[PDB]
Structure formats: C-alpha cells, structure tokens
C-alpha cells in the first residue's frame, strides 16, 4: 500500500470545520482505491488529530513523515496550523495538500494550496461590497496570522477604492463572549462587518448577534471562513441573509457537482452538506494521485514536477494546478445564505482566476508581504 | 492536567457509528472542565483513530496507556475492537470505558461496560418478538464475535421458547452486496429478521432490502447495533417501520434527556441526533469522573473500588455501576422507527434491569 496522512482538527474549537474535511478526503481515497488505486497499489490513510493545536499539528506532521513514512499529508485549516506544518514538510521534503482559503503571501515548494488565494476570495469580496454601497467596514476576526494578514490586505484595498475601516477587533480562537464586540459594532454603526472568525467562535458570535437585535437587513456580515457546513452547525436561522465569498457552493449547477453532492450524501447521509473547503479537500486527493500517476512515482520531486499544469473537472468548474506557485486556478463566487442554509449565488467570475498569492497583479498591494525577490 | 484517551473508529466501515461517540465524550469532558474539572485539574483528551481495525485498536490503546500515560480510555465499539483492547488494559492495569451493546459472556476487571448486557437488549428483544407472534427467525449479522455469540444466545433462547431459526448468514464487516442474502430471505419467508450487522454494511443492506420490494410490514427487521445516528446515515425512508431494542432513544421523555438533547444539538447542530451508544459514551465520562472524585485519585485500583454502586441520573433514567461486574443497571426499551428517523417506544421495563452478562438468571443459558 501507499500510506497517506490525514491531519485535521478532530477535537477542539476548529473541529466544527475540519472533521468534514477528513470525510471528504476519505471518500476520495475510497473512490480511488475502488478504481484500482495508484501505481497498482491501494491508498492507506493514517488519520491524526491536530486537536486545534498548532504545536500538535507540527509533531503529528513529523510523525506521519518520519515514522509512518507517508507519501503526502492532506490537512491543516488555520494558517497557524499550516505555518506550523510548513517547516516540517520543507525540512523533510514532504508534501502537504492544504484545502483552505487563506491570506496568501506564501508559496512553500512543499505545500499545494487547494483553497482560495486572496485574489480569489478576500480581494473580490471587498470590491463587490464596495461596488454595492458598503463603504464603512468593521473588521472582526480571530487573533492569529490569517485574520491579521487578511485585514491588512483589506485595509490597503479599501484605501485604494476610497472606503474606510471604522472598527477592528480580534478575539482568541474559541472565544465565546461577543457582547463587548457587538456593543462596539452597535456604537460604530458600520455599513458591513467583514468576518474572519474561524472555528466554533462563529457559533457564539452569530447567535449573540441576532439575540442582540441585529439581522442581515440592518447590518450584513461578509464571511470568508465559514460555509455550508458551519452554517448548519451554527444554525441557518442565525445566518439567513448574510454573505459569503468562496469558489464553490453546494448549489453550483454543474454535472460534476450534481454527481459530487449525491455521492457525498450517499456515503455520509442525505442531511450532510458540501462546501468549498470540502470540495478542495476532495479535489486535493485526486490531484495528488493524478500527479503520482503522471510521475510514475510518489517521489516528492517527481510529483512536484508532474503536478505543474494538471487539470481537473472539479464540481465548482474547471480547476488546474498553477505551476508558478502550486495554488489552483479557481472561479470566484459571492452568495447570500438562504433559510435552509444553502447559498444563493449573486456574482461570479466568467472564468477561473489565476492564483496570485502575493498580489503581484494588484498595483496597490506593493508593500504588503515585505518579502524581497520575485516571489 | 489529567490526560484521558479517546479511541474510536474515525475512519473505515465503523466510522458511521463511532465518530458521534467521540463527539459525546468530548462534550462531557468540556462540561466537566467548565465545572472546575476533576481533582482540581482539567481533563485533556487524546483522540486516536482505531480505523475500524482491531490490530490498530490494540496498538493505539498501548500508546495511550504507555506513552501518553492516560488515566482512562473511552472507546471501542465492535466486540472485536474491545477484545483487542482487553489484554492491553489488563496487562497495564489500565481502564477502558466501553459504551456499546454487546454479547456479554465477559467481565474484565479493567473494563467498565456502559452499553447493554444481553439480558438488557438481545434477550428481551427475542422474547418480545416471540410474544408478538414472530416464531421463525432469520439471523443476519457481520462475521465476527459479537454477532456469532449473539446468534448463539438467540438460538438457545428460541429453543427454550419454542421458536426456530429458518436461516443464518454472515457477511464480513464492510460487505455491500446483499443480493444473495435477500434472495435467500425471499425464499425462506421468515417471520422476522434479527439483524446484527455492524457498521456501514447496514447502509447497503436496508437500501437493497427496500429496492428488492420488501417492506417492514411484510418482513420486520429487528436491529441491535444501529440507532438514530445510523438511521440518519442510511436514510429513514429505508428504515421506517422497522424495529430496534436499546436502553435509550432520543425521544425518551425525561427532564434529563430534554437537557441532554438540547445541549448536544446546541454544540453540534440542530440536525444532530442522539442515541443509546451516544448517551452511554456521555455517561461513561461522567461516571469515570465521579469515581475519580470519590476515590480522590486516578489510581485504577482506587477508581475501581470507588466506582462500585455509583449512581447517575442519565437521560434514559437512573443508572448505576453494578459492583458485581462493572456493567450498568439500565432500562430496556423496544421501539419502531418513524418516518423522521426517530423512535416510537412500544415497550419497556418498569425499572432498570441489573446487568447479567453471563445470563446466570436464565437456566437455558447454562452451556454457552
Ligand atoms: Br472524527
């Protein structure tokens, strides 16, 4: 067999988000094994709990690479967990397939990024909001590197467009008391809240937000780290009318997505939903396996070379590994949450967008990463 | 902190059943930590994947006890996984809290059994079926020790009652092709199927059973290893009208269960269900913590002594650790599956039943 690692938060504040990623990866593995496996071998998943603990993510990655001798690790969600795994896969010349939207400003040669780069999510989210009258942003997120960097990007883009930030607050991951933040929002009276909270902190915020008398008609919240899965956990009654930006919705009308959702529901239950992180985790297993097949080997250097330019008929639409940076070409979509927790798409790119993690195509994003070179 | 082990199948054919037990144990741990913890320390869970693989369960139990140095392990489902963990906890003098119904005929001093003993599930299931006109049983289960031992018990009891078995078939865990079994069932024309399939084999069987044109009125299926969680995974449209026997349903009307179901849905989502193994997993964390608090130590020998007789107002009703065998006194309930996957209770005992894993109160069970 060919052993593959699965490294996700199965416990802790992030487990609301990451458990269904392990499910999506195992489904793709089961599908590939039933079709004859890879290089004549079956895939054997080694599942490890990251426990929403970034030191634990690092030690588990070291064990999977050095002890279990996996060929690849599928996992991580928070950029804190990814950046904890980054030195491990780089030092061991391992591979991490990372399925979660994030802040960009990174391009490890040992990470394949299946989630949105900022030009494929956060940046067009701001532009669409601005173009639709939202000028005064209130920034709320969790206190770690992704929301801090995301809000750094958002402020620079808002300065370019002509908008302002009238509030900025951070809470530790797993925080549950949002009355103080909500009271500040009530006083500031912003046009929109841009929400970068991650994990089950979102359960507490959106419940306390509605209980405080605020609904989506009075103050829309645009979220980038929750989707259909978390919406079902929080409760669609607390999210109806609020906004998300992703590359994929369960409601996407493609033949590929129709098959994907039925298969996911057939395996895990008719009540189960799919969303963008779930799609990216499923995509990531298929793309890695396709690179191994093309390379004729699980050797990381050979897999890295073969993965350049590989395409996939993904549920969201056509995707492709960008050889420049090991990110994915993805379609951008913005939608509003429906009463049943599904997304009604309001806007999208007419084609997949090339990933641009360092925002090289955005003239206003010059000194954001502070890193030298051509990136 | 006090490290505790969680050892369940988070991958493989058993994960349909066991992942929610990890959710239940983690919720109880969080509740206990928010009430000041245990002996002044918070509980730190170490979650390990058993991978529906009994050799993996044994190795993970060894790591949890020897390297992580946990004070207890909550986990296992299949009697194959429990019996692979059994020698590890005995050799290391560890403790396993095991929350799943099983065949009995076992009483490890290093295992606390929160799921039903056979006198608390399988045995009354047969008697109620027999007393309601089912005389010709067709037995179908997964090919390992629990369904084989359970069917041995069922055959002994049916011979005592005056019933007969007109069929008995086993499929390996994870089996998905039930056309042959269903064809044999169609030819045997049994009164009832007694289902001991475990894991996502149940998904394929019940779907193919309905698509073969067999409804619950024409042929009721009594199951002992699936409940509300698996019913939602399979789809209630295939289970509507079929039967189960447990000690708990989500629909149980007690004040404690109203609180339990509300808290479970509040943490994990309003669509999530509870069932008997989920309750037992939640029960086991609280009962272990109470034994530690009473003993004033996590030392296994002291915890074992303090646990004798400890009560708990469980969502299902009053329970208690039987000092004779470290099993739980539990109420017996039989119910039918509704259109929404919930259970309508048809019958129950008026009081919790003392656990009797060796069936010493049944003279027909002498030679097992
Ligand atoms: Br899990």
Q: Is A87 on the interface with B (CB under 8 A)?
A: no
Tell me if B51 and A47 make a contact (CB, 8 A cut-off). yes
Tell me if B22 and A11 make a contact (CB, 8 A cut-off). yes
CA B222 to CA B242: how far, in whole Å?
7
| Residue whose tokens read 């915020």 | A205
Contact predicate B78/B54, CB 8 Å = yes
- Provide the token pair at A100: 């979660």
- Provide the token pair at A149: 């960097």
Contact predicate B330/B355, CB 8 Å = yes
Contacts with B271 from chain A: Cβ below 8 Å: 232, 271
- Provide the token pair at A179: 């009355």
Contact predicate A258/A278, CB 8 Å = no
CA B115 to CA B100: how far, in whole Å?
4
Distance B211 CA to ligand 1 centre (A): 31
Contact predicate B66/B1, CB 8 Å = no
Distance A18 CA to ligand 1 centre (A): 9
Q: A243, A199, A241: which is closest to A333 by C-alpha?
A: A243
Establish how many alpha carbons lie within 13 A of residue A276's alpha carbon, considering only the half-sphere containing its beta carbon: 31
Q: Distance (Å) from the C-alpha of residue B359 to the closest C-alpha of chain A?
A: 37
Question: With a CB-CB cutoff of 8 Å, which residues 124-163 of chain A face chain B?
Answer: none
Contacts with B51 from chain A: Cβ below 8 Å: 45, 47
- Provide the token pair at B28: 């109880």
- Provide the token pair at B115: 């799921």
Least CB–CB distance from B232: residue in A22, A232, A269: A269
Q: B277, B278, B285: which is closest to B95 by C-alpha?
A: B285
With CA atoms as reference, the chain A residue closest to B269 would be A233
Q: B241, B186, B177: which is closest to B207 by C-alpha?
A: B177
Helices (H), chain A: 15-34, 54-66, 79-91, 122-131, 145-161, 179-188, 201-211, 228-234, 255-268, 276-295, 300-307
Chain A with chain B: Cβ pairs closer than 8 A: 39
Question: Residue A125 phi/psi, 5° resolution?
Answer: -60, -45
Contacts with B268 from chain A: Cβ below 8 Å: 233
- Provide the token pair at A312: 């996939």
Listed by the residue before each break, gaps in chain A with C–N over 2.5 Å are none
Tell me if B47 and A51 make a contact (CB, 8 A cut-off). yes
Separation in Å, CA B110 to CA A178, A293, B91, B144: 45, 48, 9, 22
β-strand pairing of A311-314 with A317-321: antiparallel
Tell me if B22 and A10 make a contact (CB, 8 A cut-off). yes
- Does residue A50 sit in helix, strand or coil? coil
CA A22 to CA A32: how far, in whole Å?
15
CB atoms within 10 A of CB B272: 21
Dmax of chain B from CA atoms? 63
Q: At what angle do helices A276-295 and A15-34 cross, to 10 degrees?
A: 40
Domains of chain B with CATH codes: 2-116+253-329 (3.40.50.2300), 119-251+333-365 (3.40.50.2300)
Q: Is B34 on the interface with A (CB under 8 A)?
A: no
Measured between alpha carbons, how far apart are the two ends of chain B, in Å?
Answer: 44
**A264-273 long-range contacts, Cβ below 8 Å, gap at least 24?**
A264/A24, A264/A27, A267/A27, A267/A30, A268/A23, A268/A27, A268/B233, A269/B232, A269/B233, A269/B234, A269/B235, A270/B235, A271/B232, A271/B271, A272/A20, A273/A228, A273/A229, A273/A231, A273/A232, A273/A341, A273/A342
What's this structure's resolution in Å?
Answer: 2.1
CA A187 to CA A54: how far, in whole Å?
35
Tell me if A49 and B51 make a contact (CB, 8 A cut-off). no
Give the mutation candidate from B4, B23, B49, B207 for the A interface (greatest A CB count, under 10 A): B49
Q: A251, A314, A321: which is closest to A291 by C-alpha?
A: A321
Question: Residue B360 phi/psi, 5° resolution?
Answer: -70, -25
Contact predicate A61/A88, CB 8 Å = yes
CA B103 to CA B196: how far, in whole Å?
11
**Residue A36 CB partners (closer than 8 Å, separation 6+):** none
Q: Is B10 on the interface with A (CB under 8 A)?
A: yes
Contact predicate A55/A84, CB 8 Å = yes
Distance A48 CA to ligand 1 centre (A): 9
């Amino acid at each position: 067999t060919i052993k593959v690692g699965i490294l996700h938060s199965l416990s802790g504040t992030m487990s609301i988000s990451e458990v269904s990623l392990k499910d999506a990866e195992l489904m793709a593995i089961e599908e590939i094994n039933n079709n004859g496996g890879v290089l004549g071998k079956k895939l054997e998943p080694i599942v490890e709990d990251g426990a929403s603990d970034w030191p634990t993510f690092a030690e588990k990655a070291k064990k999977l690479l050095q002890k279990d001798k996996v060929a690849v690790i599928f996992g991580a969600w928070t950029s804190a967990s990814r950046k904890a795994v980054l030195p491990v896969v780089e030092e061991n010349n391992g591979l991490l397939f990372y399925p979660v939207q994030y802040e960009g400003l990174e391009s490890s040669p040992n990470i394949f990024y299946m989630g949105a780069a900022p030009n494929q999510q956060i940046v067009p989210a701001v532009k669409w909001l601005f173009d639709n009258g939202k000028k005064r942003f209130y920034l709320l997120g969790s206190d770690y590197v992704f929301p801090r960097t995301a809000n750094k990007i958002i402020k620079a883009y808002l300065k370019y467009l002509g908008g302002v930030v009238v509030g900025e607050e951070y809470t530790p991951l797993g925080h549950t008391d949002y009355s103080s933040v909500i009271n500040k929002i009530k006083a500031a009276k912003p046009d929109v809240v841009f929400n970068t909270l991650n994990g089950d902190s979102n359960v507490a915020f959106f419940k306390q937000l509605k209980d405080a008398g605020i609904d989506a008609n009075t103050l829309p919240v645009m979220s980038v780290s929750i989707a259909e899965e978390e919406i079902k956990g929080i409760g669609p009654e607390y999210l109806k009318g609020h906004l998300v930006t992703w590359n994929y919705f369960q409601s996407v009308d493609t033949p590929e997505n129709k098959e994907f959702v039925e298969k996911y529901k057939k395996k895990y239950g008719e009540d189960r939903v799919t969303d963008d992180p779930i799609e990216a985790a499923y995509i990531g297993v298929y793309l890695w396996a396709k690179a191994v097949e093309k390379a004729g080997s699980t050797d990381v250097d050979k897999v890295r070379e073969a993965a350049k330019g590989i395409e996939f008929n993904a549920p969201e639409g056509p995707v492709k590994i960008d050889g420049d940076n090991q990110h994915l070409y993805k379609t951008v979509r913005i939608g509003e949450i429906l009463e049943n927790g599904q997304i009604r798409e309001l806007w999208k790119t007419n084609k997949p967008v090339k990933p641009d993690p360092y925002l090289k195509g955005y003239e206003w994003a010059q000194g954001l990463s502070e890193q030298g070179g051509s990136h």
